[PDB]
Amino acid sequence: PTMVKFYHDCLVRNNRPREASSLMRLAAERGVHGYEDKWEADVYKGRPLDTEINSVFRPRVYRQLWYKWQHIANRYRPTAALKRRQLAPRDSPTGIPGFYR
Amino acid sequence: NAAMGLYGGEPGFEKAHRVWVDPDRPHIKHIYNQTALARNLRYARYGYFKRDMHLLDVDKLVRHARLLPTPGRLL
Amino acid sequence: QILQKGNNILYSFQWGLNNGTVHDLDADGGTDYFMDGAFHVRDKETGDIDW
Amino acid sequence: APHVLEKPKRVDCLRIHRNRPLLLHPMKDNNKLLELSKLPARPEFDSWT
Amino acid sequence: ERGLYFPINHRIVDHRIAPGVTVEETDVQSRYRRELRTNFATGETRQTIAPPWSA
Amino acid sequence: HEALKKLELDPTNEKRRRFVIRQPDGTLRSAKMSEMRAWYWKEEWADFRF
Amino acid sequence: SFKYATKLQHDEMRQPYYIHEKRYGIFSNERNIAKARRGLPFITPLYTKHMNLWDTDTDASNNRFFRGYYYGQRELHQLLGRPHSLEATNADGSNDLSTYEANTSQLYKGIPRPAITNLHYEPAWRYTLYQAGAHGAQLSNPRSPFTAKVLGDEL
Amino acid sequence: LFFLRMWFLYGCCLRFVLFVLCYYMSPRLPSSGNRRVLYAVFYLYNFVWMLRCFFCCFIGLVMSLFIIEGGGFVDLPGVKYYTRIVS
Amino acid sequence: PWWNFQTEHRQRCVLMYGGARTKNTHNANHRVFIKKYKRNAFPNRTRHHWAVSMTGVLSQRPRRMPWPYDLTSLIFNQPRQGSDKIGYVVGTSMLKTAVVATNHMVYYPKFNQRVSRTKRFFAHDEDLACVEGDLVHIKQCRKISKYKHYYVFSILEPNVEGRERLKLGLKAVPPPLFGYPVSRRIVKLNLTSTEGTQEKLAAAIQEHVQDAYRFSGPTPDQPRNR
Amino acid sequence: RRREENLYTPIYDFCHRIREATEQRKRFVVVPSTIETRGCARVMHDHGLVAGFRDFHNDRAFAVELKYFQGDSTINVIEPCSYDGRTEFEWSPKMMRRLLNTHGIHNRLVVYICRTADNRIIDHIHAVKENIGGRGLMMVH
Amino acid sequence: ARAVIKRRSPQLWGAPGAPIIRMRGHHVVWKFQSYDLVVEHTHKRRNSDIRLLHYLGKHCPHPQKSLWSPDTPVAQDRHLFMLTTVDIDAFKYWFGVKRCRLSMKPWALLAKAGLLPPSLTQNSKIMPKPLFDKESLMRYYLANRKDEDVMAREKYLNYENSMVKTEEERAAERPVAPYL
Amino acid sequence: LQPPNLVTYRQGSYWKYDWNAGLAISTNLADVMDPRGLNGCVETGRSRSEVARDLGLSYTRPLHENEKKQLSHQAVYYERLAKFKMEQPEAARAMERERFVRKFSGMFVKMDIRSGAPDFPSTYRRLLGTKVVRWASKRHGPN
Amino acid sequence: RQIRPYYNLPSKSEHGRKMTGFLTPYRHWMWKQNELWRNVHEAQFEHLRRVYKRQWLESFRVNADEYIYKYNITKAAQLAQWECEMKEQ
Amino acid sequence: RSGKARAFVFRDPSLRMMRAGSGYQQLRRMGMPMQVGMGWRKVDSFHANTQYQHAWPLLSHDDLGNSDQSNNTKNIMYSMYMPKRNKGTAPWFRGADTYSVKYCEQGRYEYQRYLMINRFPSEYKKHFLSFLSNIRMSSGSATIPQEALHWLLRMIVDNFNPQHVHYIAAMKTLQSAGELDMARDVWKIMERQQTWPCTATICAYLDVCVEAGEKTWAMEAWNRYCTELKFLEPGEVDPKPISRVPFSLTREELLYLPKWKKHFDHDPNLDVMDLNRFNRTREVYLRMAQVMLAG
Amino acid sequence: IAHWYCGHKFRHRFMRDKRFHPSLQASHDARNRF
RNA sequence: UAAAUUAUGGUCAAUUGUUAGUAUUCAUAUUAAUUUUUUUAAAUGUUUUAUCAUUUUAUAAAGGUUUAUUUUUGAAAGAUUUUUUGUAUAAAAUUUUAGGAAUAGUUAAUAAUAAUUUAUAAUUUUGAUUAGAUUGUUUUGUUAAUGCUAUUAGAUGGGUGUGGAAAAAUAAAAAAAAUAAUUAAUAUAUAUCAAUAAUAAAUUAAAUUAAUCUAUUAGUCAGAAAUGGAUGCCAGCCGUUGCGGUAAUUUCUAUGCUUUUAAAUAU
Ligand SMILES: [Mg+2]
Ligand SMILES: [Mg+2]
Ligand SMILES: [Mg+2]
């Protein structure tokens, strides 16, 4: 799904909706978690072939500790925004140096 | 400290490793310094260089040293 | 946040003969008792709970 | 239009130092944390579907 | 991106214009630094002012 | 100001403290001396001289 | 002193509010209240300090805090050249005047005398342009002859 | 006063603990005898801690939860926590 | 009723007669510090936080407060606090600027004494009159740069020696021979010849790899045997 | 001699020299000559705690003749207000009047020395009388 | 002027503006209830002290016997008292100079005190709201009408300067002969 | 009389010896230079440089080569620009177009308090770690 | 709020509010009668507002005059004391 | 060595109390710590301690915990309700008898001393322009002519100097509004504060005297100030140059001179000479002549 | 002296306070104290 | 280098823990607070209009900041009218950690320049920069007192940038363009604050409207009060010194006693 999303964004940024539609069809057929439901009909049925983005991507190891503690504290409410005082009392270290970078 | 280690704590990666400076072509400004834990002035005199007298520049030692003995006793 | 009266409430749900009462009532010199979570009867040859 | 549902109380107050109730506000959609969380932990061994 | 979003050198407001015409009626566009260049930089030295009759 | 109680209660001052008592009949009148003094922290007067 | 004196909530042991008005102009907090980002967590600072302790006006002559020797006055004495000692003859901390002070006068140097000093020597300028109760308080006193005459016996 | 004795209390005078083990310990001489010591376990801030305490509570039933209080000083060399009195 | 005892409190809704109605914030809370790091592995590299650290800007103990009764306020009638400052210009390397070191004063009521704290400022000057050593007077003004909001008003003391040295072409003041230490570890002078440069480099790299090995920890009493 | 050592003052050393001479039963004491020390000696002589004093016009020191009564000394204790010259203590008129008020009874037994803004070394009795507050120097009784 | 309006406590013309006199009081047991007449902006934040132009004074809505006064046989003077402490100078300054606004409860309190006429809210159900007719109003206007000069003089006295200087004061103030 | 160390010299303690020795201000300024142009007008608030330019004086210290080069380079700016814009308007117009579109495509085109903050990282520190990444240190200057 | 009668014009629109802002001519006439009573109270209110402003201005004038007199006396005394002290110095 | 130090004897309680003359509580009571936060809650709070700062009678509407509605609470007032010095101490009597009798003997405004409040020259110009604009007009159509004199008095009490421009504006506004007594009061304020009028101010006051019809005022004005006025001689310089050097302080006059001498607020008496620089005495002569004719 | 501040022993708190002592404050005469 | 007086003035400073050779503020008291005997919800439909729209409705908790948070009168108040006058983004000081070293789209000049100008740049051992902790300079508690010990809610990036001002995505004790209401203060469900609650703890009664309601006082060696039985360094007790070896004033238990009184216990 990560490379599918990156390729789809690159296609829509380079203005190739035909290739974007082909990628969407492939993803829908395969069953990728992100693109299981997203399926669209073919509109190019009669013609043959021939700063911008604001996002941040870092490897897993950067926030693996945050992920681990989030799932340890609240594994039943994934959308909880684990914060201070949930795992450490006042005037005490929270354990993880550099929360949210 | 950004080049070595992320925040610290890991032993051996808090203090910068040993830095060697060529006095003829200094790569730092104000080589000598005064600090409670960084007194390097005493480590730039005669007596510390006897350990590496087998490979050193006697001309540079003469040019820049402290309490240098007489040339006869040096020879 | 600390619950402390739970033991007092639980005391009412222990219907029967409690370990202390049975341990006090028994009056046999050949039956010895110990306690890890409650009073249990110890078998001499096994060195464990007399099942 | 199934809008008859009442406002959720999924956020639950937890007691903190001076009994000030801390509320776990749900994360906003415009962040990468949930995107990273939804992916499998071990891509090599965990199923991708 | 090189420095501050609004440099101090560019926060110039002109009082020679009417108060309410710069916001909506028009926008004055000029390089105001040239007239505020100091006498030390521009080499100007204040000579004694002569009266009109003697000038 | 309680430190200026004498000046506030003195009628010979144009800046004296002002009071209004609206009776149930609808007319307003000046407060009595007791009512005027009631708006200050109470103090005990005593003299052991005699 | 006692514990009750530490309760600044009382209006008896607290500096009055009008000091800030006297310092920054009459009716100055009306503008400050209208500030949008006020009280979160800060408001405009209030200069509520006793008039006899203001550092802007007072000096070593009539202020105790300006007579501190080792830091308030020792540096000044060193700068100005006055011979200074801890148990000095003068209150500030200088044993004697400096050479410049001794040699040169300072009466007519720095500023001409303000013309308003004539109020203390001429009684002719003492004016009260309006009566004491000219703003409608003429009837404040109920037993004054003025009020009695203006009202009448029936009133 | 000693403030490092109540390390495992973590401020609160009452610590809600579970029950895992109960053994006997000999108090410091010359006070000879056997005293019942409770090895108990609790969890605090998703961290499990185990401690040895004095089993002052008299047994009248089977219990899996206990309340740890600071208590006083005891002749037992190392334990510093008492069990809450039975109510 | 703060002055009333605990058992004397019949009610707590209002003050019946007068006084100060103050919240009874509980100071005796027994705050606890939880050790979350190894003794020699605290994440910070300079300052270690091993206990409850007192928080506050002015409420900390011992009490420290600003002291407006100093030399600058004794000399000047400042319209605003800290408007005017007298200091010596130290450092003239940026064009049309003059770095001035002015010392304010902080008072400790507990000890009932004051100390002076030195602060540096960037003072703007035209025609480049401020030379090293001048005793100058500076005042606040409009913002000029990111860190320039003071300007010189008068040069109380001219540095005649510095001006004469500049006229002769030499620097206004010889550079100091001692500076900030680049690193905590001492800096050893390198005197090796060209032939011995590689050997000295090898020795230095061996020392560095030994310092890296120090990360492993204490050497075991029993040597590793398989 | 060192930073940690207290910054001694002429008032402090004058007080300690007088106290030591009193404890050792001496007649004449040579004490440093400053305006504040001379004022303190004059006030003590006025109150009778000291038999007499003389300011020989020597820049360093002057002489004080002590007094004793019934074998013991008429001076019970002398203590300077501040040990360090860095710290300076100011005495408010209410803090001075609290000395006179002894649980409801007027008391002028213990003597306190203050120097006012007029360079006039007086005692707390006169300071209270004229309602002025100066910096304190010593307590003697 | 908000994407999501705070529907619980809306106001008019935004913030901050139009200082208004209200009666703030914490919701406590009624026997310990006491309000505070105070002038504040139209919009207030969580704590009322942020927007507080001036403080008018306390009001205790509890009828109390006059224990301070001696026990008098006067029937009207022995009725229950409802004490209210108010400020006059600040109230006049904010009402006239700054043209503030007032709420119904402070208006009723000030009407009781005599500072203001009775508020529009308080009305007697016995007397209905009357109606008007132009012809009858004109007939009354013709029946009685004040002189223009005297009406201008009274308007000037009420609105513009009223403390005038007469000829006696002018003669007293005029310079004396030596400097003439 | 070389300064002992840079750490002490920066805080202005090397020249503090003259202050402490009682010779803080004793130079007979009138003889060494004209004192009329070395002060400032309190009534107007204009600085010593303004007083000197009003009186026609110039108290300029001797200058090294680098500052003279800087002054010449900054002075030549208007003369170079006036002829460059006339002779080669193509590149100037291209740069003007780029700046015109850059003012639209930027951060905080409105001059609010956030954008007006002269020291943005120092003023807004709480968002310097998790919200922004452009700055690594919360302060960069003496203030 | 603004009262909306039940007998008003019904907006025959489903895409908006069910009632219009217009009104019956009787409603307009009766509104004028009610608005006439609003003007009776506010005119006295406005007049009382102006007279209070006048009273405050006059009191400020008199009190400020007295304060200016006293302050000028005090500052003249202070300046005379300062010049006497300067002569003694 | 590991033990701490112990005193040989106690420290004198009087000395210990006397050394506390500059404690933090004393500093707070003197008001040295400047306030920037909100402090305690004032209005509309459970602990809002504002309505208790002004005197009020005891509340006895109903049972307040001691059945105050039917109980003689003399002892209750003495032991609970009246504030104490501390827990268990004697009740703190805040009554008027505790305050000194000398508080009542002082005259009005004699407590306030003289203040030297100086500001930046830009701030002075801004304040002068704002006050001039307010004197000219304070509101759209509600500007009473009395408001001009009100703003003049506010400028006075704010420790400002009403320059000749301010005096001209105020006198002209009041004369145009037809209230000449107010203009006479402005002139009397100028006389009281010893602002020497310039020729333009003299002309404005003479216009006020002309419209009022009082010649004695012009008699006084001519005797006080117009005596030195002279016409322009053919040999004299007509456009006289600026003569008053702007205020400045040298090193000695900055270091040794006292603060009150160094302080400088814009005083119209300094620039009256520069405002009399154009020799407009003919207007003054004409106004005096027409004053005499009116009289 | 609160027990949680600085170390368990009181001399830790006293040593921590001694670094803020006005007489020992960092200056030219006393520098690099730590 | 002189005394005082036309006599208490100018308005209260006051410290209470039965120890245990000595050294050193460290066990047990009092006050304040937490703790047991079940006190103690943050409400769901804001409104008007010219109708698929427009007009009015601007700081709640989320994100961890110690050289740091600072600004408007263009809306409103606001008035015969037109018209006019002014601003303001900037500062200064106080800034935490047991074992302490480097920091960085970076300083200044120039300008509506420079991703690529010029310069011997700037921060810091007078403790910087990252990291940890904590919502900053009117709040408490204790004391005779220079101290010590507390305090709160809210300013966490932009990206068609509306608006006077972003504070703009549930959270009222805010009547918001017609007098809706003034006999109103009373307030029935889901997370939280003090309306949270302190009520003559046992003998002559409630000038009323009769409306809400139970818990063992703990000890008995030293030190208020203990005898008999059982145990015999065992079981146990313990603020403390310690007690239990066959007469135990310290355990268990019968009975009896004690209490300045409403608990006990801990932090
Ligand atoms: Mg602890
Ligand atoms: Mg941080
Ligand atoms: Mg025995």
SS (H, E, C) chain J: CCCCCCCCCHHHHHHHHHHHHHHCCCCEEEEECCHHHHHHHHHHHHHCCCCEEECCCCCCEEEEECCEECCEECCCCEEECCCCCCCCCECCHHHHHHHHEECCEECCCCEEEEECCCCCEEEHHHHHHCCCCCEEEEEEC
SS3 assignment, position L112: coil
Break chain F down into helix, strand, coil percent, rounded to 5: 25, 10, 65
Closest nucleotide (CA of A88 to C1')?
Answer: P133
K36: nearest Cα among K92, K84, K90, K88: K84
Longest CA–CA span in chain L (Å) reads 65
Angle at the Cα of G4 from the Cα atoms of G1 and G5, rounded to 5 degrees:
50
DSSP letters, chain N, are --S----SSPPPHHHHHHTTTT-HHHHHHHT-S-B-S--S--SSSTT--STTSS--PPP-SS-SSS-TTSS--HHHIIIIIS-BSSTTS-B---SGGGS-GGGGSPPTT-S---------HHHHHHHHHHHHHHHH-SSSS---THHHHHHHHHHHHTT----HHHHHHHHHHHHHHT-HHHHHHHHHHHHHTT----HHHHHHHHHHHHHHT-HHHHHHHHHHTGGG--PPPTTS-SSPPP--PPPB--HHHHHTS-HHHH-----HHHHHHHHT-S--HHHHHHHHHHHHHH-
The interface residues of chain B toward chain L in range 6-35, judged by CB-CB distance below 8 A, are 30, 33-34
Closest nucleotide (CA of D20 to C1')?
Answer: P192
What's the length of chain D? 49
The CA distance from L124 to K119, in Å, is: 51
* Amino acid at position N215, single letter: K
- Contact residues, chain J, for N22 at CB < 8 Å: 89-90
CB K69 within 8 A of CB K45: no
The CA distance from B47 to B44, in Å, is: 9
Residues paired with J113 in a beta bridge:
J123, J138
The answer to whether the Cβ–Cβ distance between A97 and I36 falls below 8 Å is no
Interface of H with A (CB under 8 A): 10, 45-46
J141 touches strand P (CB under 7 A): no
The CA distance from I128 to G16, in Å, is: 48
Residue in chain L lying closest to E9 (CA) = L118
- Contact residues, chain M, for G97 at CB < 8 Å: none
Structure tokens at N8: 């040989």
What's the length of chain C? 51
The CA distance from G7 to F41, in Å, is: 18
Chain breaks in chain N (C to N over 2.5 A) after: none
Q: Which of residues 140-179 of K touch strand P (CB under 7 A)?
A: none
Per the rule left: phi > 0, alpha: psi between -120 and 50, beta: everything else, J83 is alpha
K25: nearest Cα among K111, K91, K109: K109
SS3 for chain K, per residue?
A: CCCCCCCCCCCCCCCCCCCEEEEECCCCCHHHCCEEEEEECCCCCCCCCCCCCEEEEEECCCCECCCCCCCCCCCHHHCCECCECCCCHHHHHHHHHCCCEECHHHHHHHHHHCCCCCCCCCCCCCCCCCCCCHHHHHHHHHHCCCCHHHHHHHHHHHHCCCCCCCHHHHHHHCCCHHHC
Identify the nearest ligand to the CA of A98 by its number: 2
- In angstroms, what is the span from residue B8 Cα to ligand 2's centroid? 16
CB A94 within 8 A of CB A88: yes
Structure tokens at N141: 């159509």
- Contact residues, chain N, for J82 at CB < 8 Å: 19
Find and give the residue nearest to P3, measured CA to C1': J46
Chains L+F touching (3+ CB pairs under 8 Å): no
Per the rule left: phi > 0, alpha: psi between -120 and 50, beta: everything else, I217 is left
Residues paired with J68 in a beta bridge:
J73
H14: nearest Cα among H66, H61, H60, H64: H66
DSSP letters, I148-180, are EEEEEEEEEE--HHHHHHHHHTS-SSPPPS-B-
CB K67 within 8 A of CB K73: no
The CA distance from N187 to N171, in Å, is: 8
Residue in chain M lying closest to K96 (CA) = M53
Per the rule left: phi > 0, alpha: psi between -120 and 50, beta: everything else, I157 is beta
Structure tokens at B18: 């040993």
CA distance I126 to chain E (A): 7
Distance A84 CA to P36 C1' (A): 32
Task: Please report, in angstroms and rounded to a whole number, the separation of the first and last CA atoms in chain B.
Answer: 44
E strand or H helix at C34, and its extent?
Answer: strand C32-35
What residue ranges in chain I does DSSP mark as E strands?
65-66, 84-89, 97-108, 113-124, 135-145, 148-157, 188-189
L130 touches strand P (CB under 7 A): yes
Mutate to test the interface with J, among O18, O23, O27, O28 (most CBs of J within 10 A): O23
Interface of E with I (CB under 8 A): 4, 8, 38, 40
Those residues whose C-beta lies under 8 Å from the C-beta of residue I213, and which sit 6 or more positions away, are B12
* Phi–psi pair at I157, nearest 5 degrees: -125, 120
DSSP state of G72: I
Q: Which of residues 31-70 of B touch strand P (CB under 7 A)?
A: 35-38
B36: nearest Cα among O33, O19, I45: O33
Q: Strand P: which positions are within 7 A of a protein CB?
A: 1-4, 8-15, 23-28, 31-37, 44-53, 56-82, 84-115, 117-159, 161-182, 185-186, 190-199, 233-245, 265-267
Exposure of I25 in the CB half-sphere (CA atoms within 13 A): 4
- Contact residues, chain A, for B7 at CB < 8 Å: 97-98
B65: nearest Cα among B23, B19, B21: B23
Chains E+I touching (3+ CB pairs under 8 Å): yes
Exposure of J116 in the CB half-sphere (CA atoms within 13 A): 14
Give the resolution to one decimal, in Å: 3.7
D19 touches strand P (CB under 7 A): yes
Q: Check if I207 contacts B (Cβ < 8 Å).
A: yes
The CA distance from M75 to N157, in Å, is: 13
Chains touching J (3+ CB pairs < 8 Å): G, I, N, O
The CA distance from D34 to D12, in Å, is: 20
Q: Is I30 annotated as a binding residue?
A: yes
CB H16 within 8 A of CB H49: no
- What is the b/e burial string over D5-30, where b = at least 16 CB atoms within 10 angstroms of the residue's CB? eeeeeeeeeeeeeeeeeeebeebeee
Q: Who among M34, M41, M49 is closest to K95 (CB)?
A: M49
- Contact residues, chain E, for L60 at CB < 8 Å: 40
Structure tokens at I79: 């319209």
CA G4 to chain centre: 28
E strand or H helix at E35, and its extent?
Answer: helix E33-36
CA M62 to chain centre: 23
* Phi–psi pair at C33, nearest 5 degrees: -130, 155
CB I186 within 8 A of CB B28: no
The CA distance from B41 to B33, in Å, is: 7
The approach used to solve this structure was: cryo-EM
Those residues whose C-beta lies under 8 Å from the C-beta of residue M81, and which sit 6 or more positions away, are none
Closest nucleotide (CA of D12 to C1')?
Answer: P191
Structure tokens at G22: 């006297």
The CA distance from J126 to J121, in Å, is: 10
* Residue that is written with structure tokens 């978690």 in the block: A33
SS3 for chain M, per residue?
A: CCCCCCCCCECCCCCCCCECCCCCHHHHHHHHHHHHHHHHHHHHHHHHHHHHHHHHHHHHHHHHHHHHHHHHHHHHHHHHHHHHHHHHC
N166: nearest Cα among N145, N187, N181, N146: N187
Closest nucleotide (CA of D30 to C1')?
Answer: P159
Angle at the Cα of L52 from the Cα atoms of L49 and L54, rounded to 5 degrees:
110
Long-range contacts of I56-63 (CB under 8 A, 24+ apart): I58/N33, I61/I110, I61/O17, I62/I108, I62/I110, I62/I111, I62/O17, I62/O20, I63/I108, I63/I109, I63/I110, I63/N24
SS3 assignment, position A84: coil
Angle at the Cα of N205 from the Cα atoms of N204 and N206, rounded to 5 degrees:
90
The CA distance from O11 to A100, in Å, is: 38
E strand or H helix at C40, and its extent?
Answer: strand C39-42
B10 touches strand P (CB under 7 A): no
The CA distance from M5 to M29, in Å, is: 14
Residue in chain G lying closest to N153 (CA) = G26
CA distance G19 to chain F (A): 17
Identify the nearest ligand to the CA of L128 by its number: 2
SS3 assignment, position I36: coil
β-pair type (I113-124, I97-108):
antiparallel
H73 touches strand P (CB under 7 A): yes
The answer to whether the Cβ–Cβ distance between I188 and B1 falls below 8 Å is no
- Contact residues, chain I, for A92 at CB < 8 Å: 32-34, 36
Closest nucleotide (CA of J130 to C1')?
Answer: P10
Those residues whose C-beta lies under 8 Å from the C-beta of residue N63, and which sit 6 or more positions away, are K31, N69
Structure tokens at H40: 């108990």
Those residues whose C-beta lies under 8 Å from the C-beta of residue N129, and which sit 6 or more positions away, are none
- Contact residues, chain B, for O32 at CB < 8 Å: 34-37
Residues paired with I151 in a beta bridge:
I124, I139
Task: Please report, in angstroms and rounded to a whole number, the separation of the first and last CA atoms in chain D.
Answer: 31
CB atoms within 10 A of CB L13: 23
N121: nearest Cα among G57, G47, I141, I138: I141
* Residue that is written with structure tokens 């002060």 in the block: L39
- Contact residues, chain L, for G81 at CB < 8 Å: 22, 24-26
J105 touches strand P (CB under 7 A): yes
DSSP letters, chain H, are --SSTTTTTTT-S-EEEE--EEEEEPPSTTS-S-EEEEEEEEESSS-EEEEEEE--SPPSS--SEEEEE-----SSSS---EEPPP-
CA dihedral (B39, B43, B44, B46) positive or negative: positive
I185 touches strand P (CB under 7 A): yes
N49: nearest Cα among I1, G33, K63: I1
Q: Check if O9 contacts H (Cβ < 8 Å).
A: no
Structure tokens at K86: 């108010």
Closest nucleotide (CA of G17 to C1')?
Answer: P138
Structure tokens at G1: 């002193």
D20: nearest Cα among A86, H8, C2: A86
Angle at the Cα of I61 from the Cα atoms of I59 and I64, rounded to 5 degrees:
70
The CA distance from N147 to N161, in Å, is: 18
Task: Please report, in angstroms and rounded to a whole number, the separation of the first and last CA atoms in chain L.
Answer: 31
